[PDB]
Write a protein that binds this ligand. Sequence first.
Ligand SMILES: Cc1nn(-c2ccc(Cl)cc2)c2sc(C(=O)N3CCCCC3)cc12
Ligand SMILES: [Mg+2]
Ligand SMILES: [Zn+2]
Length: 314
Amino acid sequence: QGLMQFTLPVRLCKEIELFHFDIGPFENMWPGIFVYMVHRSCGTSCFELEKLCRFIMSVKKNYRRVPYHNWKHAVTVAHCMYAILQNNHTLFTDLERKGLLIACLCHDLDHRGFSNSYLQKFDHPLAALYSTSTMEQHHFSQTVSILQLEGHNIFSTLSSSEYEQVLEIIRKAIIATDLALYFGNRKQLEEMYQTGSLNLNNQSHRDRVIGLMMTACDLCSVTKLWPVTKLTANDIYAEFWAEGDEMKKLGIQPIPMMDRDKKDEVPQGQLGFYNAVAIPCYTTLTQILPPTEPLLKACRDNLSQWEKVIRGEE
Ligand SMILES: Cc1nn(-c2ccc(Cl)cc2)c2sc(C(=O)N3CCCCC3)cc12
Ligand SMILES: [Mg+2]
Ligand SMILES: [Zn+2]
């Protein structure tokens, strides 16, 4: 039984190829959507179906019921990566194709809905184990834990060598989702691209480009149709405000972004974020990988919808 091609209904079969695809509210379809993407992106031969299924279900089990950093976010970020891989077929190694979809599914494993900042101020044990990229080193750790469960080793056929390469791709990919690291990473990529020194044969260059891809997938809620973007924003701020509440409980005025008393300032907050983070991210990404331009175009569409919100045209 290896003639077992997963297939989706027609509207999903078609719209899954597009950057702006929303995976829907039917939680029980998300595993199938992921397997579909791995099979098309990687091959039906990349992974042992029974092992992959058991891995996916343990990954699912280890996401929490938080408003935003949940299992739906995991599968959403994996679909953005699938769209990028599918639009840039010949640029990526076999090991990269395998590693990056798994990295994406695992990148926020066991997230509690709190920032690295909050962990450090609370004095969480994870803050003493991991001084920087606190939640991200934890996510990678939880990824290795699950790969080491009996019957969960989806990489079992790789050589000793290929196995260490793939786990090194996953680790770098996951650390890159720490937005604090994004700014420097993109500045370097921008300067490399413009002085023409960017070289996809330099592993250290590839590493930077995969990190940017990871930021791009991770922020991909800004690249959706406006109603998806707007409703996802509600989940994002549900977390931010809970953390604000927890800051207040520690005796700390949170930043306004996290203060639920300053709801009125959200639209302006989203402008800043689109201008300082999202637009620059998708701009540099489009410079390096031209077929990713639809993510930049959709982001720009959403910036303009937030400007309309401010001007009371909605
Ligand atoms: C405002 C705001 N909205 N979002 C947001 C919106 C959409 C998606 Cl799809 C995801 C996030 C975020 S994430 C973030 C942040 O952590 N920093 C810390 C590091 C430097 C930049 C600011 C700030 C904001
Ligand atoms: Mg994260
Ligand atoms: Zn994430």
